[PDB]
Amino acid sequence: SKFRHVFGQPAKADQCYEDVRVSQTTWDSGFCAVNPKFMALICEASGGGAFLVLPLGKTGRVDKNVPLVCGHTAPVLDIAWCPHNDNVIASGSEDCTVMVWEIPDGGLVLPLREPVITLEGHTKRVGIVAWHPTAQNVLLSAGCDNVILVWDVGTGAAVLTLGPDVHPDTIYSVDWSRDGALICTSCRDKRVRVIEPRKGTVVAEKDRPHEGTRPVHAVFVSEGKILTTGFSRMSERQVALWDTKHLEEPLSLQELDTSSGVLLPFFDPDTNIVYLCGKGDSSIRYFEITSEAPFLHYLSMFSSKESQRGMGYMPKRGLEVNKCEIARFYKLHERKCEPIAMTVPRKSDLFQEDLYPPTAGPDPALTAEEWLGGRDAGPLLISLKD
């Protein structure tokens, strides 16, 4: 493997974001969303709902009175940058709404309260927002009403609905496939569903990928496969790799350690690496996914003494390609956001092509109406050699 010596290297202190009141809400979302232009994290707000958005370059201590994105009338639970517009962010709130915000180049000057659009429909708090990867303006949300809504942000309309007949209990996670043809959902009723959301068809299901009582998260990995984190009977944390056409036994099931913290998976299709990090934890582990046995291979971990309250993940376009950076985590402490470069050691001056294949770019491959009518298409690809 060429990822055997991948290592984490935290930014220096003066390149961090400090003196920020990270939200204390107990919830299993990342709490941090980053893109090549801005850093956003969810704040501690008691009079309503707020999150911070700063120009990436505005490092050091944050002015205690910095403009926030407020708008929401109750705590924010989830935030995500639009993959085809670096100035647009969505948030889900305990006020039962998703709001879609526009951020100026230069960040805010004054507190932002009107969103581009307020997406009304959920009857309970909304703690999962997930942008469609390829279809312009398509946004999914899952609330604690156990309902999944898909929206056309361009028209403000809820265009698809999966009711609580589909997910009868808490939805722990939702992931779109590479081409946005499918979602993978994980439910408190212990089934991981693979759903064609347009015709609302469950195309594959695994009952109890894990035996424990705590949450299972699910992400799509390389073609045909999904990945779960979960817990054993004895609350031993597990990662499992599944072949979706044959869900009876996992391709690999590996026991990590006995903690209580939910591991969140971050899958990089350009390297076939998955990174696992939990709130409460001080480490980020990473595995490689291949088609040779045993399919899921432990690479290593970044270890630290500080436990994280959240994690963000830099899109490829913001990465130091010439510094062989293949990921950057945006790690939340109590009062601090700390970027962490993930790097492949190479001693070569040339662009490392093998490390940087063409990657999902910022332009949609389909419109909302096209994807809705039943077209699928993988993302439009760009060169990072630039």
Residue 377 domain flag? no
Question: Among 234, 237, 288, 277, which Cα is nearest to 259's?
Answer: 237
Distances (CA, A) of 172 to 98, 127, 228, 263, 322: 17, 9, 12, 12, 37
Residue 368 maps to a domain: no
Evaluate whether residue 360 is within a structural domain: no
Q: Which residue has the tokens 């971990």?
A: 301
Domain count, the chain: 1
The span from the CA of 282 to the CA of 142, in Å, is: 28
The residue assigned the tokens 């039943």 is: 374
In a domain, 370, yes or no: no
User: Residue 282's CB: how many other CB atoms inside 10 A?
Assistant: 15
In a domain, residue 349? The reply is no
Judge whether 374 lies within some domain: no
**Residue 117 identity:** I
- In the numeric block, the tokens 């265009």 are attached to 159
Q: Give dist(CA 119, CA 116) in Å, integer.
A: 10
What is the spatial distance between Cα 338 and Cα 314, in angstroms, rounded to a whole number? 12
| Six token digits for residue 169 | 């209990």
CATH number of residue 80's parent domain? 2.130.10.10
Final resolution, Å? 2.3
Experimental method: X-ray
Structure tokens at 272: 């076939």
Distance CA 56, CA 36 (A): 7
In the beta sheet, which residues pair with residue 206?
192
Range of the domain at 60: 1-344
* 126 domain residue, yes or no: yes
CB 211 within 8 A of CB 245: no
143 assigned to some structural domain: yes
